[PDB]
Design a protein around this ligand. Structure first.
Ligand SMILES: Cc1cc2nc3c(=O)[nH]c(=O)nc-3n(C[C@H](O)[C@H](O)[C@H](O)COP(=O)(O)O)c2cc1C
Ligand SMILES: Cc1cc2nc3c(=O)[nH]c(=O)nc-3n(C[C@H](O)[C@H](O)[C@H](O)COP(=O)(O)O)c2cc1C
Lengths: 248, 247
């Protein structure tokens, strides 16, 4: 494969960094790379908050569920869905844009917009020899996160992005089989076939954990999924998102 | 570097050769998509490859008559997928419905699909292919879902056309770095936001003026207000719920 494909395939989430800041040029390059992503209808429905203040990074680490790589890294970015910019447009153009901005369709548009930009930011950071990790943990405390970043109405944090010089190495995490995720023409019609593919993946995941922990853990992927999904959390999300002006 | 150069070279391609990709190129794009980070190892997506010419024609019509959905190297349909997790619920004998039907998990699934799609786009572009996301599929989700025979808990979010370009197009200017990127806190003054949008409007107006030889000089705020004052796909909340999401 070419340079781009080799970098994409080399990815693993890095959770241990040097306490050494990135240069302004590295930060700008990451952001400009994020912006170059496709955007539905040229909407650019995102904002990125860079956090360098040590006191704020420490509070964000605690809010994310005590993730120390949010406090100790090269830079911390907060990726936000942003329709506040479009509320400003509504005033400039003297047109009511609320029906569209508050709709489920636009909420999906904003989430996609942010995520495409974030993945470009991740790849740009990784191509510069930096480690990266998405921080969905911020969603445990979106109200407190929003207050710390002084977000106005119609701006929601979706996740953080830690970047920096790695202070260690980790292995690649095996993904579901290509032929399981990718379907030709139509979705897999037989659930017994899906179970069969998940059973084979479980054997791979169990062996992967067994080898990496020297037998301490042998969790199957379906076992791990059922464990987390049977304990629903962030149930305040529907109400928080609506209060912010989205998915109403 | 080459990853950054490729990222920055992006432009949506809407004119392709009617020449199919190899199976190896299709697999490479999908394996690149899968290598994206995934919330809690969830992998809450499925990708449907469409090669049937009759189906590509119907999809092009459902997308709002976008002929690059019919004529390309390959057409992918990116789906949010919790049906795989419903299968896990039966295998593990655990009720996962509260989490799977929540707004939080709906956000998780959308993010997961989009990160995978952006890796698929970059992999395709690095191979000299043109690419274009097709959100147009969202005009007709029930018909799209029926054509792809999607079960419960699977929703198409957008298509992805790829192929050998049959033409060239320019790069679309983005909002200024200093406008999108904020240090520590969000921009506290809306008068500052208006000022920056006025300057961006001058850039966008000049960009359209130069590319159309004066035929169009649309501002970005003008273009945004025009589309956003005419709400469409208002059936979306109910359709996504009917399929088990965001309840
Ligand atoms: C999720 C998504 C859906 C899109 N849907 C369409 C579509 O249906 N048809 C199309 O021609 N372009 C579509 N696009 C491409 C955008 O119009 C394009 O990214 C934007 O105009 C900026 O242009 P650029 O990608 O050339 O920089 C979509 C982009 C995204 C991110
Ligand atoms: C949107 C999103 C949010 C995530 N949130 C967290 C988080 O809060 N903390 C963490 O350590 N990892 C988080 N991750 C990383 C995933 O756990 C990781 O991508 C997954 O376990 C697969 O491992 P890999 O990225 O090393 O291949 C997140 C990933 C995504 C895509």
């Amino acid at each position: 494969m070419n340079s781009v494909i080799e970098t994409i395939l080399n990815h693993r989430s890095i959770r241990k960094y040097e306490d050494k800041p990135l240069s302004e040029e590295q930060i700008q390059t990451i952001v400009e790379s994020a912006q170059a992503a496709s955007t539905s209808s040229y909407i650019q429905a995102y904002s990125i908050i860079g956090v360098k203040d040590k006191e704020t990074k420490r509070k964000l680490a605690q809010l994310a569920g005590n993730q120390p790589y949010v406090e100790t890294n090269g830079h911390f970015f907060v990726f936000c869905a942003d329709f506040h910019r479009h509320d400003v447009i509504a005033e400039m153009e003297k047109k009511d844009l609320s029906t569209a901005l508050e709709s489920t369709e636009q909420f999906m548009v904003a989430i996609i917009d942010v995520a495409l930009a974030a993945q470009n930011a991740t790849l740009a950071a990784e191509s510069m020899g930096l480690g990266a990790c998405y921080i969905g943990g911020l969603r445990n405390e979106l109200e407190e996160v929003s207050k710390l970043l002084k977000l106005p109405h119609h701006v929601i944090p979706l996740f953080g992005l830690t970047v920096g010089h790695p202070a260690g190495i980790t292995d690649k995490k095996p993904r579901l089989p290509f032929k399981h995720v990718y379907h030709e023409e139509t979705y897999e019609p037989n659930d017994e076939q899906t179970k069969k593919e998940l059973t084979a993946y479980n054997e791979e995941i169990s062996a992967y954990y067994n080898e990496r922990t020297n037998g301490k853990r042998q969790d199957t992927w379906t076992g791990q999924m059922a464990e987390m999904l049977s304990n629903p959390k962030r149930m305040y999300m529907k109400e928080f998102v609506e209060k912010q002006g989205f998915n109403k």
